[PDB]
Short mmCIF file of N, CA and C in Angstrom, two decimals:
data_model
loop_
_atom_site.label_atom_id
_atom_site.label_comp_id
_atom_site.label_asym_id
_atom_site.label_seq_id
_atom_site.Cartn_x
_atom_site.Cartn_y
_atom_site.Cartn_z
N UNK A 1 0.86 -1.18 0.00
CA UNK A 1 0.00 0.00 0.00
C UNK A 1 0.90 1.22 0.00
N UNK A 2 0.47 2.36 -0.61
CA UNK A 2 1.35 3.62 -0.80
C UNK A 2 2.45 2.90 -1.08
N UNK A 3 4.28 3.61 -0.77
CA UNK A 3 5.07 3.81 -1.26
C UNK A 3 5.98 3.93 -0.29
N UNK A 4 6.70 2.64 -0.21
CA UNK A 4 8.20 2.78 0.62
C UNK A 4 8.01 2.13 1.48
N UNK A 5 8.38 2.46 2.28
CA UNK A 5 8.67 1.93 4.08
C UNK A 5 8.33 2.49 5.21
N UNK A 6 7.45 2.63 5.88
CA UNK A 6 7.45 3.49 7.05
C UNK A 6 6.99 4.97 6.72
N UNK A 7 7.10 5.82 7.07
CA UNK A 7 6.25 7.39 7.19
C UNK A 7 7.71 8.24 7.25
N UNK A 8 7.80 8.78 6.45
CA UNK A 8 9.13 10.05 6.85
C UNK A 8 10.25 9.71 5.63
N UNK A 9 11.41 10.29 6.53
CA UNK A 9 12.76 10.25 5.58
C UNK A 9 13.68 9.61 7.00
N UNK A 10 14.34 8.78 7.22
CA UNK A 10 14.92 8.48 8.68
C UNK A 10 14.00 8.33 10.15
N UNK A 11 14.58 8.89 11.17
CA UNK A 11 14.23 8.42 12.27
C UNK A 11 14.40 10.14 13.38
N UNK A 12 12.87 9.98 13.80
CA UNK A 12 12.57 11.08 14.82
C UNK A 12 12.48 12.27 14.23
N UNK A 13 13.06 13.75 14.49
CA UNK A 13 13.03 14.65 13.99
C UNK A 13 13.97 15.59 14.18
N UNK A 14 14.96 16.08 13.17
CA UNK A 14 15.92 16.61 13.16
C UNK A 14 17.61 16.07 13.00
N UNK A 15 17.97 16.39 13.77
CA UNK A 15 19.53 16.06 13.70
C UNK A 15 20.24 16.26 14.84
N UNK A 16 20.66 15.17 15.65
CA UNK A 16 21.28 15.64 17.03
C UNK A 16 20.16 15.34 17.93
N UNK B 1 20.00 19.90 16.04
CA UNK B 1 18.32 20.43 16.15
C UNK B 1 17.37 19.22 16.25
N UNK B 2 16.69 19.44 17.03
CA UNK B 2 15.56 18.42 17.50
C UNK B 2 16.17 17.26 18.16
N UNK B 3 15.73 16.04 17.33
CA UNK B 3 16.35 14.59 18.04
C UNK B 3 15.90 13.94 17.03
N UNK B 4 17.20 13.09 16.91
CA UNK B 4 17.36 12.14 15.89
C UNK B 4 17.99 11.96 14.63
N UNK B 5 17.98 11.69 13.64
CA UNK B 5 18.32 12.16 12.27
C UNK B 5 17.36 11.56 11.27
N UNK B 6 16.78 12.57 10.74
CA UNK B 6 15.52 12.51 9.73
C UNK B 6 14.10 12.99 10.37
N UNK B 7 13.37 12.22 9.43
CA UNK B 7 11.83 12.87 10.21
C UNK B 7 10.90 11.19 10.08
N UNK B 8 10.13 10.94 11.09
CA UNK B 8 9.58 9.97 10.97
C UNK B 8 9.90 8.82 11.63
N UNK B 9 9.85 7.78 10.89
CA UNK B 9 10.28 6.19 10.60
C UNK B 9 10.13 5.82 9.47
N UNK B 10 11.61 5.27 8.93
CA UNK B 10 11.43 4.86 7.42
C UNK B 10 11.56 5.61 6.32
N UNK B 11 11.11 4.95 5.06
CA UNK B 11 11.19 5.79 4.24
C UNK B 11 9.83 6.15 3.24
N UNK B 12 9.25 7.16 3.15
CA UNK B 12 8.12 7.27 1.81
C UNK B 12 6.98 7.21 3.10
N UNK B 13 6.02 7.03 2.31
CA UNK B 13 4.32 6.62 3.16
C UNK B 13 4.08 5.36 2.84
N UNK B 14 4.17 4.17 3.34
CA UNK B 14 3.38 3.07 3.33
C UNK B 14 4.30 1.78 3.43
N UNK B 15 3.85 1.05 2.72
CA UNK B 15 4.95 0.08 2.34
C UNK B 15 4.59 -1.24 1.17
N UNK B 16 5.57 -0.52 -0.05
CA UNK B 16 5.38 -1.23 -0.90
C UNK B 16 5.20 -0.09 -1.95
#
């Protein structure tokens, strides 16, 4: 269903 | 900035 893997681009939000 | 690296879990919306 939909497209890809999972919801987002990576993991959590941001960097650090 | 924030926590983590990226946004989400994964990659795209869904899977497949």
């Amino acid at each position: 269903v939909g497209a890809x893997a999972x919801v987002x681009w990576x993991w959590x939000w941001x960097w650090x």
